[PDB]
Amino acid sequence: AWMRTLHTTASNWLHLIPQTLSHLKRTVENIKDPLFRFFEREVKMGAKLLQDVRQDLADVVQVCEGKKKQTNYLRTLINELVKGILPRSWSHYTVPAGMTVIQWVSDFSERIKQLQNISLAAASGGAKELKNIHVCLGGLFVPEAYITATRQYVAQANSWSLEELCLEVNVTTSQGATLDACSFGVTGLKLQGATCNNNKLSLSNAISTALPLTQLRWVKQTNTEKKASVVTLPVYLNFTRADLIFTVDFEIATKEDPRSFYERGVAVLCT
Numbered sequence: 001a002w003m004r005t006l007h008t009t010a011s012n013w014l015h016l017i018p019q020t021l022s023h024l025k026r027t028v029e030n031i032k033d034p035l036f037r038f039f040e041r042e043v044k045m046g047a048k049l050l051q052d053v054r055q056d057l058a059d060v061v062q063v064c065e066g067k068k069k070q071t072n073y074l075r076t077l078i079n080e081l082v083k084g085i086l087p088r089s090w091s092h093y094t095v096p097a098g099m100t101v102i103q104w105v106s107d108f109s110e111r112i113k114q115l116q117n118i119s120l121a122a123a124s125g126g127a128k129e130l131k132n133i134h135v136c137l138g139g140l141f142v143p144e145a146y147i148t149a150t151r152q153y154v155a156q157a158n159s160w161s162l163e164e165l166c167l168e169v170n171v172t173t174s175q176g177a178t179l180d181a182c183s184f185g186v187t188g189l190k191l192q193g194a195t196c197n198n199n200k201l202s203l204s205n206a207i208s209t210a211l212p213l214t215q216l217r218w219v220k221q222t223n224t225e226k227k228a229s230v231v232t233l234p235v236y237l238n239f240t241r242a243d244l245i246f247t248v249d250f251e252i253a254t255k256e257d258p259r260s261f262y263e264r265g266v267a268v269l270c271t
Contacts, residue, residue, distance in 0.1 A: 007064030010057055013105050018112045021047035024123045033127045038149035039118055042141055046115045049092055093141040096238035111139040132179065134213060136188035138270035143237060143245045150184045154218040166221040169248050171196045172213045184216040193266035201252045203264060231261045235268040
């Protein structure tokens, strides 16, 4: 009855979840690269999580087939899966409050697909592709680590100090990908409350406007006074706002004012 349905949905998840993450992040010549280090640690963590999840869910399928004896940990896991609450063991990256296991496995599958793409790019061209690829920001396990890694990579180029770097963002369209050796194309960010019109904000009644390929560039900070036409939008990851990844300074329209943006609740969201 119920247990066969659990077996069927678990088998569907195994079919949906990609197979073992190719831990091909191995280049002693690329160790000094900060981007390579960050991507290597992320791929290692993702591969270990994939192995644990795949093994546990295959064990669940096979105990559904009835040819094994479950233990206390397996009882806890099945009691977690029956009610749809996320397994506590599988939680190693930050979690929006209360999302179902189906939502979690879909998100984890997306993260494994992008990690597969990252590993293939690294095995094809190394650090260069590790920079040119347009990694999405939402699926990354520790996005702030990615921002720090990009800052370090830009610092190594031209041998600039880490603190001499300030982030500037420009939003593109149609996937221009006109990188200037410091831009970091990133996708998936969703602007809640406004729209971007040639990098100029404007309040819109419709919420959650998708931002395609918001280029991340680090430049010398001139310590000049920011004009009144800029706003500091908090960048969160979940739909709930409980994790500040970084901050973005956007130019607003001539008619608009920062007070209205602060009041309306505008904030960039990765998911």
